[model samples]
Target: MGSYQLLVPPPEALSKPLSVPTRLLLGPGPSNLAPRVLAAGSLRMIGHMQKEMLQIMEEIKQGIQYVFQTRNPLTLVVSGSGHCAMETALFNLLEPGDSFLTGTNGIWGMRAAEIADRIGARVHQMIKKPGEHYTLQEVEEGLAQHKPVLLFLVHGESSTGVVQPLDGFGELCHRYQCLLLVDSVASLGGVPIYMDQQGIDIMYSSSQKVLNAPPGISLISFNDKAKYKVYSRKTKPVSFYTDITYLAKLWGCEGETRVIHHTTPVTSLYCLRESLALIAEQGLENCWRRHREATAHLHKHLQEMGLKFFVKDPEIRLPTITTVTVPAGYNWRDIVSYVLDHFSIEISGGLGPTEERVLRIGLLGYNATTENVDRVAEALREALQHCPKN
Candidate 1:
């Protein structure tokens, strides 16, 4: 055997221990976790296919069913980020040449449309201003015109801080013989969502959001109607990793014999299980009420401080995230940096079209408390005075 010379040496950074800052996450996602969730994630890791792991997964399924308020057998967590679930839903539902309609009021909707287009689906968009939500009549018009196989909507638009009303959307989509898909990444636990009663065929949220878990996993469910679409598709889904059927078998949703589709993020699921259990123990209604009340308190304080909200309609503003119109002469970046530098808080500017136009403050799950709201309010108050104006 020929001796090989080492060309690349290990980096010096690996010599030191890992150090992460303790930050009060008050941004769009990856919120500070509950102590229970943190501890659960740090528990001993085992085989992904072991019996104990299977039991843990079953418990996770029950938690998801309860959190989603759905008995859909297809309920399972995606192994990747929120966008992973979104793509899974789209790829499985829409075969090539299928008509896909996306309600474009925020970044999520736009991203859904792009994903559908990338999958060779004929994408149609029903456009609305960033802070505005679509009316049922507009959706009906689009459905009648495009006759899409799937319709995408963002339940809580964190970028624009608007919550789209879902009252009649499901019925309308079914009337057009279309499956209704919702991105509830920012709204799931904090907002009221009855998946079955609301007729949401496919719905997905992130563990990192209101669940207060790590950012690697995504919560997703497909009702009977959505499953039918998945099974009846002519061609295989473009992505094998996100193929819902394979994931279903892995999660034991398909049959008694669980298949090893892939190795899941076991530790993240542990964190998610603990987070869901916390929500169940607290009661979902109380969780929703706490978020609403905390947001209302934030709104009150911001109004007292003379800041205007990006979304003018209080009814449509997202309870999880509040968007403040960036004040004139003051740079949004400066404000964000000042708050982080002084208060060790994490607030965001905006995304896509809302960039630099608004500042987004998210109070989700463990962070959705009146005390945290007061802290963020005070931070904003100080930032306004101290940060340099453009």
Candidate 2:
């Protein structure tokens, strides 16, 4: 027999393209992307430093400003997701051994505290009782006592589905001469967030939740106060990839010279630009009103289905994501799975201390509509019927 070698295909020949079925995303985040945003992602790729890409990047900066209600030129998208935005703000603004303060009522706050701790910063926390939010008075008190260099607040704590009020918070932080940072990942477009007007020194958000885009990028804005802090940092920020000072130079034009930091996610930026344009066409106030209305409708339908809300005070409940008490004797996981398999709908279970006791449903971006609210409610009702009592 002739010594013949068997022919082998290259890895590319063996690999097949993935077939992603269309899904109705209604979970905690990554809501459905608008048709336009999805289409934008399919465009040709260009060098990250190309002029066309930079123009698109500038459009993204403007879009971020529009969504965040800020005129700060430092507004830009962080290459990573929401958490990266938070870390970038903290890394750039705070030096080691600086003091940080947060209201530990939910996951994001705790995460902030943890991140600060990891960075060798001192963390002070005022943990709210379960199902409770920090009052303005309480926040003022904490700020007064801590006198910390940086203060962190989660505008919407998705883990608890509670909207932490921001009234007078900025004034309080300013009074204490502390920098105010806000995580609006779950609240940005679905709620009202005027970063400049509210006195937020720095604010960050994810595209998935309310921007109706995928989960790759996070938009962030920093005022002059925050920039000054970054400029005066002693030790360089721990992470170069998330270093805000470097990112600012890359995005800003300082005496006609431009710096390049990292390879910006070009396609994701396009999606975010399209998403912001959609929001602009809808108007900020109108978008917030839509979310509020959808939440109200969802609450009513959930109540009709014999469900109880986790947050007793409707004023504190988040408009985009709602946390409801699991019905007595029902398997929460089974209910979630049944809805997905049968109705092609998805919802989330609670997080941390609230897990196994609550069911979370997201009404974000395009999902914040009367039809989706009604459909999810109907699916829940049917799913519960099939689930066995715990």
Which residue ranges in model 2 land beyond 4 Å of their true spot? 1-17, 253-256
Candidate 2 local accuracy as lDDT?
A: 0.85
Q: Which ten residues in a row have the lowest lDDT in candidate 2?
A: 253-262
Global lDDT of each candidate: 0.90, 0.85
Put down candidate 2 lDDT per residue, 1-390, tens digits, no spaces.
569976875778448877877667788877887789889878788898789988888888888888888998888777777566778888887788898898889878888888888888889998986577888788888888878988898888888889988878888899888989999999988888888898999999988888887647888888888888888887899888777767777887233445755657777877888888899999999999999999999989988889999999989999988899988888889989998988889898998768888889998888888999888888998998888886
Runs in model 1 deviating more than 4 A are 1-3, 256-258
In candidate 1, what are the lDDT values of residues 261-358, reduced to their tens digit? Answer: 66678888889889988999999999999999999899999999989999999999999988999998998989999999999999999999898799
